[PDB]
Structure formats: structure tokens, C-alpha cells
Amino acid sequence: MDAQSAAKCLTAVRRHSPLVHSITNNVVTNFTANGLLALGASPVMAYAKEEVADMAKIAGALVLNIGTLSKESVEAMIIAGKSANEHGVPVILDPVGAGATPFRTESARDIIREVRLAAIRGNAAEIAHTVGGDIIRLAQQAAQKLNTVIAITGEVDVIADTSHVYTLHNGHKLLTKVTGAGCLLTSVVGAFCAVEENPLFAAIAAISSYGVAAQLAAQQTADKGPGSFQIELLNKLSTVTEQDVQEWATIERV
Amino acid sequence: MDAQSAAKCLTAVRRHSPLVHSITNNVVTNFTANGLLALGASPVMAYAKEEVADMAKIAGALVLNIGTLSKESVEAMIIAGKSANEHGVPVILDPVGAGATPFRTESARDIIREVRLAAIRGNAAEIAHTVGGDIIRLAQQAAQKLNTVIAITGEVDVIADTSHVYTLHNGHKLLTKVTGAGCLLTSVVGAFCAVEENPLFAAIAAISSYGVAAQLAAQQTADKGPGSFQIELLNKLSTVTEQDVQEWATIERV
Amino acid sequence: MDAQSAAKCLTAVRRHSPLVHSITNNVVTNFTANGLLALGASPVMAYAKEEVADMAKIAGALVLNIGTLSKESVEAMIIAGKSANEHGVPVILDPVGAGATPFRTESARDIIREVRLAAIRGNAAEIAHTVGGDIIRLAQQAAQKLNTVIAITGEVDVIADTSHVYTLHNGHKLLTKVTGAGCLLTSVVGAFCAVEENPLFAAIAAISSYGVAAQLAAQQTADKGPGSFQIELLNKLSTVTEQDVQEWATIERV
């Protein structure tokens, strides 16, 4: 997997405009939808139990985010995940806060038991509670245990499936000043999984394309601030090119 | 109905700052409120059953949007609609997704039975499931059946009441890249219905003013992207003038 | 309390990046989080009963906003407030709409009975229903009755604790065109209470710093509109300096 192939995946996403069903928290629904629209995907945000099953089945990917949990939204997420599983739609999980509060950890473990996942994206603590050289081993152990793809996020991202491991070096710290920046990335990974057969490559391509857009947006923002960055990021998800990804994406097979 | 009269309606909205009660989905509440504030209206977003009745009764217009449905929010919408009906407050419905999932279609038909509507805005499929020359006939048939105003949206908008039909030619494709752009338009139609006696003229004036602002915003955005467009659209809802509407609104009586 | 000391509080907030737990309405959650991130604080938006207690206990401040009430979210707010009270975490209340509808007034009075508050921020009507020279007396009467700090907002803000009263003269009218601008201010007051021992000084420092950032943002926005202002405000919460606060904050002890 390289920058050249990641660029090709970004073009496939724009070409097909995949329907990406996201069940996420209310602090980031609007931004998640706008980021996906800018990227070139088709967002669908239904979250109620009376319809999530019908939505998930026709989507290109289902993304579950436990940011602002509730007993009911977790149940809807599982109903959606089971429907997605029945119809061969890939499911991506973002176990936000797993290990921080008991309810989050329980909900994350619940989903892992009831839904087969194509990929899980979270920080080291979140992945451990739900499931460097130490980060690489954690990613490999979890990927092998759940027979899935694990993307442990940080300034350096470690992605692993049952047999391979990669480190990615893209992005900008300004992403930490925009709420939903991480949540949107997991949905972008979903958009890529909807067009790329292998979830490991989809994830690498997704994280790389997003990090490049974020870097280019930060360059333009200069010292304007986090408000301008938020708008520039949406602009760059739309204007970032294959050439930009080939030139700035840093993908390393370990 | 013409561009000159539509411009006059826009000035009336700014003058009176109508209280527009919107019960909409969580992906677009913030944008809907901000668009209405920019336009010069007063948004009120209460959605809970314990208060929607009290809110609707003092509003200038009530707008119902079924974007991210739930059994409870539909019930609140009907409670609000009945209250609005009792106090002579016009009710506008946006039956998003009607015909796509069973639950949406059911909920839309439910509202149509329980609440008298001043106007319904949706795409062709949505209007048909809830209720060119073929689009014109659909709008006329539905307007006559429900004794209401039907605004079928597309690149060309077809608006009809029991006896008249109009086609409108305004707007920009960038609206498709901003979540809530359509939802906000239905609430803007509500803002216009709050000041214009005839719901057909209110709708025409609303859609025209919004399309002109969208075109002017797209000109300014140039090739910046969907992030800049979102911000420019809010800017133009605020700065668009009567002169702009007279010069760029395309209204045709069929 | 002066502009020089208010500036020092702003630096303390940036230094410590306080965890500010906000339980607010869905129209303003994203903006509240982004404003706090821009300011230099750490927002946490959990609102479900199964976890709010665990969140509140580790936060630097808890802020309750009754904007889009529901029987359940009020109960969660009280659970969170009691947890905050047990662990010495300051609680700030924004009784939006108190006195406008019966349900709001009831909910506000409920919170006042069950949760000890460090500060309450609202307009004159809201403070009266929940609890010039006349505004000053209202603030003093309410502050003395509830043994708390009362910040009555307007173009001129009146802040009072059991024994002192201050008037603040900062801000810009463009704040009225951005949904969540007021709601975000109450959360900013929370961010300041998390680092400043005396809630009266924290509130004065918070409102002053926010008003200065708002004025500077309005200068930059010029005649661009409310969309650009929203983005500029976020920019200025990030870039406003101690020097800016010393030069533009107007604080008067009555």
C-alpha cells in the first residue's frame, strides 16, 4: 500500500459518491455530514430504531460512534449493525471514551459481541479497553483477536490487520481544535471502505487523504485561527487532488 | 406574482422579524437557526411534548421537518401542529425521505391527517408518497387534493395551489454540498408565510429570495469550496437586497 | 476586580485547559464545544443519565443549559449537578426561557432546589422567574437569596454576589445573529470558574474576555455578514491576548 494507490482510492470515492450511514453523537452530526459531502460522499444520519435497519441495508458503509451515548442509541446501533452484517455492508466502529466511564466500556464491548466489524478506529486506551513498538503490538494483538482492522490514532497512526502493520505520518494539530475532526475521520474511513475491497487499504487511503487535506488546510489558515481552519478543512476535502496525496502522504509498512 | 413583489416580501420579513418555530432533525438545527437569524427572522427550536404546544401558539409560523424521525418527535410535531391550527398559525411540512423507508411514509401521512397545512415542500417522490408537464400535474393534483400549496423542488421549482401553477429558476448546485440547505429553505418559506397572507406568494417569494442569495454566494465563493460557500450563504441571506431579487429572481406563471 | 486581573484569568484558562462539562441544547452543542476549544478549554458534552455523574465528578466545571428541555434531560442535569456538588466542582446555570413557558420555569426552579450553584446567567426576566438601578437591585436580591453569583445579561451586564455589584460594557450586537453565542458565554463563565477561586471574579473575567473577542471579531468582519462573524468569533477566542483585554474591557464596580 502506497501514496499512489491511496490517491486512486480517493478518486473512486468521488466517482461513486458512496452512501455512508453514520450513527454518531449530536455534537458532531452536522460536521460529519458536511465533511462527507465535501469529500464527495453521500451522508445518511438516521438513528431511530424504527428505521436504522432499512437505512443500513442499502448503504455502502455503516459507521457507529458512541460519543454521546444513551441506552437507546446503543441498541439502535446494534440493530443497524446486524442489518448491515446481513446485507454485506461494512461496519466501522469508533469506541470514543471506551475505558473512561463504565457505561462507555460496556457499550463498546456490547457492540463488539453483536456486530462483525470491518474496522475499529480509536486511541490506544480505547482500543485496549474495547478489546511505538508497543502500539504496534497492541494493534496486531487486537486485529488478530477480532479478525478485523485496527487503526490506533495519534500524531503517528498505526494500522493493522491480522497479518500486516503500517504507520502513517499525516495530519495537523489544528484538528484538535475542531470538534468532530476525529469523528469525521472514522466516517471518512467508512466512505473509503465502501469503494475499496480490502479494509486495511481503505483505512490507510482514508486516513492519508484526510491528513493531507488537513495539512493543506492548515497552510492556508496560517495564523487566522480554529474558525478559519474548520472552514478550510471542508474546502480541502473537496479540492484535495490525487497529486496532493501522492506528494504529501507518508505511508510506511512495518 | 413577480420578482418585484417577491422583493417586497423579503423586506417585510426583515421588518417584522417573525418568530418561526421549527421542529427539525439534529443534523440541521444549528444551521436552520443561523440561516433564519441571518435572514432577519427569530428562530425557536423547542421540540419536547411538554412545551411545543405553548411555543407553536405564539409563533408566526410552524415548520415540521421529519429528517431524523423518532416515534416521539412525530407525536410532538402533531401536538405542535394542532396547537398552531387552533391559533391560526400557518404550518409548513417538509416530508424528507417520504417513500424511502416505511416509517417515514407512515409518519408523513400521519401528519397530513392530523394537521392542516399551509404548504408542503419536498421533491417529487416525497410529495407523491405523502399525497416538466408531469411535475406540474403532480403539483396541481396534490394541491387540489389537500387544499394546500405544494412546492416540488428541483433545479426548477414547481409551486402550485388549488388554482395556479408557477415555475421558479434560481439557486446553485453548491446548495447540495451543505447539509441543511434544503431544510433551511422550508423554514425560510415559513418565515415568509408569517408575513405574507397568501401561502402561494409567500412560498414563491421565499424560494426566489433564497435562490438569489445562493447564486450571489456561489459567485463570491468562486473555487474556494463548500466550506466557504456555507459561510457565504449565511452572509448573503443577511446582505441580499430587494434590488438583487428584482434583478436575479426568475418567476414564471404557467 | 479590573481589566488587568481579568486578563490574568484568561491566561490561567489557556494554561490549565479546564475540562468543562456542558449539558446543553442540541441547537448549540457543536458551537459550544468549538468555542471552548478555541478559547483553550477542554469540552465534555455527555448528557445521558447512565454517565453524567461520572463525567461531572472529574470536570473543572459543570454548566447546565435548559434551552431545548425534555423531562429526561432535566433529570440528567440534576444527577450531574448533585455529583458535581459532592466533588466540589462548580455548577453554572443558564435558565434560558425561564418565565416564557410553564415547563421551563418549573425545570429552572427544580434545579435551583436540588443543585447548589456557583453562578446563574440569564436575562432579567429569566433571573426573576427562576428566583439600571432596578437591574442592580434585582441582581443583588437574587444573589443574596440564593447565596450565589448572578450575571444579568444585556448590552450592559450586571454581575452581583451577596455583597458586591459590577457593570460590564463589552460585546457586539452581531452576537445576536449567531445561535449559541449566549449559551457559549455561560460555558465560558464555567471555564473561568474552573481556574478562578472566586466565582464573581471568574464571571467578570469570562464575560469581559468574551466581549472583547466579540468586538475585535466584529471589527474584522466589517460588512461581510453573520456567517463571517461566526467564524471570526471562534478565531478571536483563540487569538485574543491579555493586552487586548486590558485595553478594551470595561469593568465598573458599583
From Swiss-Prot, chains A, B, C:
Homotrimer. This is Hydroxyethylthiazole kinase. Transmembrane segments: none annotated. Substrate binds at residues 45, 180. GO terms for biological process: thiamine biosynthetic process; thiamine diphosphate biosynthetic process. Changing residue 183 to A: Reduces activity by 60%. The lineage of its organism: Bacteria, Bacillati, Bacillota, Bacilli, Bacillales. Catalyzes the phosphorylation of the hydroxyl group of 4-methyl-5-beta-hydroxyethylthiazole (THZ). Pfam families: HK. It is an enzyme of class 2 (transferase). InterPro entries: Hyethyz_kinase, Ribokinase-like. The keyword NAD does not apply. Its EC number is 2.7.1.50. Changing residue 183 to D: Increases activity 10-fold. It comes from the Bacteria. SUPFAM superfamilies: Ribokinase-like. CDD domains: THZ_kinase. Belongs to the Thz kinase family. It comes from Bacillus subtilis (strain 168). Its cofactor is Mg(2+). Pathway: Cofactor biosynthesis; thiamine diphosphate biosynthesis; 4-methyl-5-(2-phosphoethyl)-thiazole from 5-(2-hydroxyethyl)-4-methylthiazole: step 1/1. Keywords: ATP-binding, Kinase, Magnesium, Metal-binding, Nucleotide-binding, Thiamine biosynthesis, Transferase.
